[PDB]
Design a protein around this ligand. Structure first.
Ligand SMILES: NC(=O)C1=CN([C@@H]2O[C@H](COP(=O)(O)OP(=O)(O)OC[C@H]3O[C@@H](n4cnc5c(N)ncnc54)[C@H](OP(=O)(O)O)[C@@H]3O)[C@@H](O)[C@H]2O)C=CC1
Ligand SMILES: NC(=O)C1=CN([C@@H]2O[C@H](COP(=O)(O)OP(=O)(O)OC[C@H]3O[C@@H](n4cnc5c(N)ncnc54)[C@H](OP(=O)(O)O)[C@@H]3O)[C@@H](O)[C@H]2O)C=CC1
Ligand code: NA
Ligand code: NA
Lengths: 312, 311
């Protein structure tokens, strides 16, 4: 497989370039950045190669600028981790419009060149995923965003630590916005397949304070160390692996809705999806508790309105 | 296994804390830094936990200041990546004197609380390895440095790209100083076990140009992105894995010499070693070509001079 990382010089871009190169099915990877960062990428390329030697792995790594995106041709997946840094002289909405412009230009320019899957990380990821879908003109299965896949991982850790199990023994998910209107699914949270509400220590599990910590986790990591890095990069590789080996797993990604859940359409948002070699193979309308379903509809309304306000 | 990382807030310390935690045999890892960096470590801990969730791994990560190193007790391996930044008109000897004070105090305070292996990354790594050994009073099998293990990895890449093979299909090593007196061993360089001088395309292999690039590889990465990160971190985990599973491999590390090679002793430097659960289980005196051996003796004298100037 060939993958391209647009934004490879950033915090997430550099870490995900390293982890992707290690993967045995990833034979070619393009690190792509603005011209001013090419020398950073050359050092990143040497450092990653050294790491492959120490870890028994291999890859063909190429560095390119984003002036000529024809190099993306042949990429099965193109990961977009580009984004404008937050500063004080810009509002949240101003920053979203700047990123929307970046995402649109990349989506339009990549689509002139080839058909690839667009894996969007740029925030606000649900809005940017929808923007890239519309501007690229790609099929809906080919454009998706990390979304609440990452928040699900933060929930998973806290559950595992409370119940005293290997982190991998927990499976849980959060749907809706990658944001404060996210909807954690206690109805789909299990340890070794056992719903956590059937475990003896569940009665004292402060799950709402845990959810609050998940809602606040990204901003806390930004405050403590500047920004999330290994978390998002590993979550990206997890999805890439599912696509490359056609695993068919029920995951959660920011995906385009086309009527599967209560006839809702015209939005990208965190939902249950089956992921395989064609990307988003289906959006899976699972049975939600009433509070979960109403909160998901609420998150959809909030995200649709964000999309309209960034476009305007 | 329990591991402690001293200097975890730094560039290599952070990347290596992430890779160690992923390892299935590492159940507990202490991230240790100066008190002013603990907030960074708290965020690193959260970020690593998130990564473990995404990759099917697990660990118990604890954040501690270096004020009380009793938390190191029970660590099988303690990795020291703490070191000052080389600033302006600083010589290599200036660097070594500042970092030797850091390494001396860590080694003495750790030896007060427990017996552990000391895996030295702090530069100049051959000198800091010797300093940690003497100040800790540990047995020589317990103290070693990364040394030319990292340079060997850069050599491996260059060879693999010239001959067009998987990087892992190359095995090669560089002995001597982690520095510009390092000694590449073409006599111990092979692809699929085949000495590369027996391969048809070896005649056009620009050996000398490749060697010069390897010698400058660390400096080049500093120029382009500010410092190496993933290369060193992955080379560290590779050694920890050999120790944790008692693999018994012939690798290259900065280790204490005690007469194995031409009676040379009283120095730590990159040499062929057999690594296992006890750390450096032996220094292996392999057959060197005459020029490789003279270059190695030169490297030994240079490193010894640096050890004296720091004493
Ligand atoms: N959805 C999620 O789970 C998460 C989302 N994110 C988002 O991902 C993005 C990347 O985050 P992070 O890596 O921490 O950010 P960094 O600031 O560390 O990296 C930014 C990257 O974007 C590039 N870039 C910046 N400005 C522009 C521009 N005007 N045009 C093109 N490329 C540009 C940079 O290139 P250069 O070096 O040339 O400046 C660099 O590669 C952000 O939008 C961030 O909000 C991050 C956290 C998690
Ligand atoms: N052997 C090899 O192959 C390589 C060697 N190295 C060496 O490894 C070390 C770490 O490199 P790198 O991570 O890039 O450097 P960084 O500057 O990024 O990190 C240095 C680390 O040392 C700590 N530190 C700095 N000053 C002191 C002090 N006075 N007392 C205690 N701790 C201190 C820092 O903690 P804080 O944040 O609190 O300051 C930080 O954790 C250096 O000595 C470097 O030369 C690096 C490259 C490869
Ligand atoms: Na690979
Ligand atoms: Na582990």
């Amino acid at each position: 497989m060939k993958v391209s990382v647009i934004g490879a010089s950033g915090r997430i871009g550099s870490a995900v370039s390293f982890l992707l190169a290690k993967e045995p099915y990833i034979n070619h990877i393009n690190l792509i950045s603005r011209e001013k960062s090419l020398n950073k990428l050359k050092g990143l390329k040497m450092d990653i190669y050294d790491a492959l030697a120490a870890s028994g792995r291999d890859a063909d790594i190429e560095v390119h600028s984003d002036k000529d995106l024809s190099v993306v041709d042949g990429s099965d997946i193109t990961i977009i981790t580009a984004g404008v840094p937050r500063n004080g002289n810009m509002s949240r909405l101003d920053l979203a419009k700047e990123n929307a412009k970046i995402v649109k230009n990349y989506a339009r320019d990549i689509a002139k060149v080839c058909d690839t899957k667009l894996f969007m990380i740029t925030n606000p990821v649900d809005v940017m995923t929808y923007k890239a879908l519309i501007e690229s003109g790609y099929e809906k299965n080919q454009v998706f965003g990390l979304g609440t896949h990452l928040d699900s991982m933060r929930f998973k850790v806290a559950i595992a630590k409370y119940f005293g199990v290997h982190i991998d023994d927990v499976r849980t998910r959060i749907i809706g916005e990658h944001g404060d209107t996210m909807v954690p699914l206690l109805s789909a949270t299990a340890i070794g397949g056992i719903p956590i509400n059937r475990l003896p220590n569940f009665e004292n599990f402060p799950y709402e304070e845990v959810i609050d910590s998940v809602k606040n986790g990204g901003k806390k990591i930004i405050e403590l160390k500047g920004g999330s890095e290994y978390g998002p990069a590993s979550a990206i590789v997890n999805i890439v692996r599912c696509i490359a080996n056609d695993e068919k797993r029920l995951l959660t990604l920011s995906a385009y809705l086309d009527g599967e859940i209560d006839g809702i359409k015209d939005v990208c948002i965190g939902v249950p999806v089956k992921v395989g070699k064609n990307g988003i193979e289906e959006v899976v309308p699972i049975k939600l508790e009433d509070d979960e379903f109403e909160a998901f509809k609420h998150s959809v309304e909030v995200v649709k309105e964000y999309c309209k306000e960034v476009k305007d």
